[PDB]
Design a binder for this molecule. Structure first.
Ligand SMILES: C[C@@H]1O[C@@H](O)[C@H](O[C@H]2OC(C(=O)O)=C[C@H](O)[C@H]2O)[C@H](O)[C@H]1O[C@@H]1O[C@H](CO)[C@H](O)[C@H](O)[C@H]1O
Length: 393
């Protein structure tokens, strides 16, 4: 019994089932049991599963949790499988796979590459009479756009920039700063005004009713109820590949735009979108590795995936599936190519303590948006606690 688990929304679950069925057709001795959840529920269910020694054989993994699992003896080093050809890396440049490495070991195999984007509903932009001039626009331009969208189109100008552990670090990079120290022992940025400026802007957007309160965001059941899909927001902040799921769930014309203020500091990164990992507890490690190889290198399988989990890490596969892509699937490839004319290498995997820092920043953001703590005070409390968490590693 080969257990395979991932996070995502309905569009991802639909074709992943077909990829699994295709693997079983080609390998009829294999019976796969699939397990899936949305992002939040996925990590919540995975943690006590790992404590019980019951992780699935193939785990969809994120860089933000790679060290949390890999430095706590949960994950198998995949390097033997790349060395003996079980997972073929001949068409994968090793620089893409390094997003799954912790020090010397390969704890996750990168499945794709993506780039942060501002995704917009073109019909709602037109309703408000507004446009995005993506090459050069500023955070101030974005805030004005969000007010224009609420005042003139009656919709949000932000989906919430959720979660803060993605978009506050993006803001830091637009200002030439960094969230984590390279050694992982504390926060890199030293000027609390950066935190204050970011969360003051979030508070203004919420108070102007152009961005959701935490209680509204918590109501979102699954991807079909996300703001961009229901038309409650004209704007959503997501990775390039996530455009595809949205485009399959709404008829509205959606576009990918470069986020504000990426130009000067090359704030965007070519990020490992997600990974597959194998737990040390697995009784089917070789079969799990063979499934990973199939997922990344099989062209037929990738004609079902169509970049929904990121641009394929195999250049051979990524170019071979381009003729199969339709307009919306091609829009993502075009966006990544455009962003890549001014982009940075991804930062290494997040340090141990990332999982606790993520929740700390979400909790702190909630308190700011409910006006229970000022951004000035929260900057200080966040730094103190984040550094207490990180100094353990
Ligand atoms: C922007 C959010 O970043 C991460 O919290 C997480 O991204 C991971 O998943 C995916 C993916 O599922 O394709 C790509 C990234 O490379 C991963 O690190 C979230 O999934 C991601 O976006 C969330 O998307 C949902 C979509 O319904 C909501 O819009 C939610 O508010 C976003 O946080």
């Amino acid at each position: 019994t080969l257990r395979i688990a991932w996070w995502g929304g309905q569009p991802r679950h639909d074709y992943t089932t077909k990829v699994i069925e295709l693997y079983e057709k080609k390998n009829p001795h294999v019976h796969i049991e699939a397990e899936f959840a949305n992002w939040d529920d996925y990590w919540k269910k995975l943690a006590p599963m790992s404590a019980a020694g019951q992780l699935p054989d193939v785990i969809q993994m994120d860089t933000a949790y790679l060290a949390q699992y890999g430095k706590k003896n949960q994950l198998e080093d995949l390097t033997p499988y790349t060395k003996d050809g079980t997972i073929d890396v001949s068409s994968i440049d090793e620089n893409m796979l390094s997003g799954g490495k912790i020090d010397n070991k390969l704890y996750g195999f990168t499945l794709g590459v993506n780039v942060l984007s501002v995704i917009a509903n073109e019909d709602l932009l037109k309703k408000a009479g507004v446009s995005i001039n993506q090459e050069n626009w500023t955070w101030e331009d974005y805030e004005k756009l969000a007010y224009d969208l609420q005042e003139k189109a009656g919709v949000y100008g932000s989906n919430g920039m959720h979660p803060p552990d993605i978009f506050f670090p993006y803001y830091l990079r637009t200002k030439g700063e960094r969230f984590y120290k390279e050694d992982g022992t504390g926060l890199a940025y030293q000027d609390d005004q950066l935190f204050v400026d970011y969360f003051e802007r979030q508070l203004r957007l919420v108070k102007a009713k152009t961005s959701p309160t935490p209680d509204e965001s918590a109501q979102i059941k699954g991807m079909e109820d996300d703001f961009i899909v229901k038309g409650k927001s004209a704007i959503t902040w997501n990775y390039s590949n996530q455009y595809l799921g949205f485009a399959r769930l709404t008829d509205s014309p959606l576009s990918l735009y470069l986020p504000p203020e990426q130009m000067q500091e090359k704030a965007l990164t070519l990020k490992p979108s997600m990974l597959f990992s194998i737990p040390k507890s697995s009784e089917h490690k070789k079969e799990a590795a063979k499934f990973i190889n199939f997922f990344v290198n099989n062209e037929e399988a990738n004609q079902l995936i169509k970049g929904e989990r990121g641009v394929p890490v195999s250049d051979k596969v990524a170019d071979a599936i381009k003729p199969k892509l339709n307009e919306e699937e091609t829009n993502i490839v075009e966006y990544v190519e455009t962003a890549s004319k001014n982009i940075s290498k991804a930062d290494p995997p997040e340090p141990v303590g990332s999982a606790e820092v993520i929740k700390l920043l979400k909790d702190t953001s909630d308190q700011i948006l409910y006006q229970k703590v000022s951004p000035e005070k929260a900057a200080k409390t966040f730094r103190k606690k984040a550094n207490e968490i990180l100094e353990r590693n």
